[PDB]
């Protein structure tokens, strides 16, 4: 597995008319999956990270936008990165997107981090594009290899004991961080419970405590739940992704929670910028916005 | 002790969807300590 060669081939399209494919060999992609899987299992399921770092929300196969985000934020290892999940589905180039991200995880294992999103799950990415993309360009066996890899992704991160990061949101089940640590991998995403909620829940201004989530999975949670969670755990901020937000980032509950969504003009359907949150060594957080003309 | 604070707004990096990823239309602001 020649990681430098793989990265070079993936990045060769930075100067191309957008939309061009990069077709790695199937065995190379299998190698990315297998080596990254080993690394994910060797690191905690609840990551403990230190600033400075840049935190990104959903990418959803918008590969050229990922390249634009790295151009703005600095390509690894110039900046340390934490991604909050949702690398695949919806966009046209899930394969290039996840291959570049896994390649960077292998190249910079202590400076580059990927969390699990709700789309890094076979039952979801079977229907929202990734299975079809794998079948068309490669084969179903490759899709199953990705599934085995995704089943090993970590599911939350805490930055400097102050910023709690996950793809979806809080869970009524989450009382102690050790509950996250005790989750064994590989695992699928269950249809309910703590891991499900960390990938699926959403904040809601109209909910008192915990409420219905009309995704048909997990819960909504209100501002008071956020405040109580932060106070209980001596945290300052929840950083999550999972919903399109017009400006690329959006605060909730008097800046106690922020949503990041990093795929601009999502699906060619939404009027949104993408953003990442840059966290400096003092935990001063800034938003770098990638905005379509 | 470290505590979360928020920095000044940064002007966006503006891009044209039809242009290469290595040629942004306008460079966005970058944070400094
Ligand atoms: Na901790």
Numbering used by the authors:
A (entry chain A): 7 to 299
B (entry chain B): 390 to 422
The paper states:
While PP1 exhibits broad specificity, it acts in a highly specific manner by forming stable complexes, known as holoenzymes, with a host of regulatory proteins that direct PP1 activity towards specific substrates and localize PP1 to specific regions of the cell. During mitotic exit, PP1, in particular PP1γ (PP1 isoforms include PP1α, PP1β, PP1γ and PP1γ2; ≥ 85% identity between isoforms), is essential for histone dephosphorylation, nuclear-envelope reassembly and chromatin remodeling. These PP1γ-specific processes are mediated largely by the Ki-67:PP1γ and RepoMan:PP1γ holoenzymes. Ki-67 (3256 aa) and RepoMan (1023 aa) bind PP1γ to form isoform-specific holoenzymes.
The Ki-67/RepoMan residues C-terminal to the canonical RVxF motif are not present in any other PP1 regulator whose holoenzyme structure is known, suggesting these regulators bind PP1 using a novel mechanism. To identify this mechanism, we determined the crystal structures of the Ki-67496-536:PP1γ7–308 and RepoMan383-423:PP1γ7–308 holoenzymes complexes to 2.0 Å and 1.3 Å, respectively. As predicted by the ITC and NMR studies, Ki-67 and RepoMan bind PP1 using an identical mechanism. Namely, Ki-67 and RepoMan form a classical β-hairpin on the top of PP1 that extends from the PP1 RVxF binding pocket towards the PP1 N-terminus and then back again (~2600 Å of buried surface area). The structures also show that two established PP1-specific SLiMs—the RVxF-SLiM, 505RVSF508Ki-67/392RVTF395RM and the ΦΦ-SLiM, 515EL516Ki-67/402EV403RM —bind directly to PP1 in the RVxF and ΦΦ binding pockets. However, as predicted, the Ki-67/RepoMan residues C-terminal to these SLiMs (aa 517–535/404–422) also bind PP1 and do so in a manner never observed for any other PP1 regulator. Residues F517Ki-67/F404RM and P523Ki-67/A410RM are anchored to PP1γ via two hydrophobic pockets while multiple residues in Ki-67/RepoMan bind the side chains of R74PP1, Y78PP1 and Q294PP1 via polar and salt bridge interactions. This orders PP1γ L1, a loop that is generally more dynamic in most free PP1 and PP1 holoenzyme structures as evidenced by its higher B-factors and less well-defined electron density. Because these residues are critical for binding (removing them decreases the affinity ~five-fold), we termed this novel PP1 interaction SLiM the KiR-SLiM (Ki-67-RepoMan SLiM). Our data now explains why the phosphorylation of RepoMan at three distinct sites (S400, S412 and S419) by Cdk1 inhibits PP1 binding. All three residues, like the Aurora B targets S507Ki-67 and T394RM, are part of the PP1 interaction motif and their phosphorylation blocks the interaction with PP1, which, in turn, prevents the premature targeting of PP1 to chromatin.
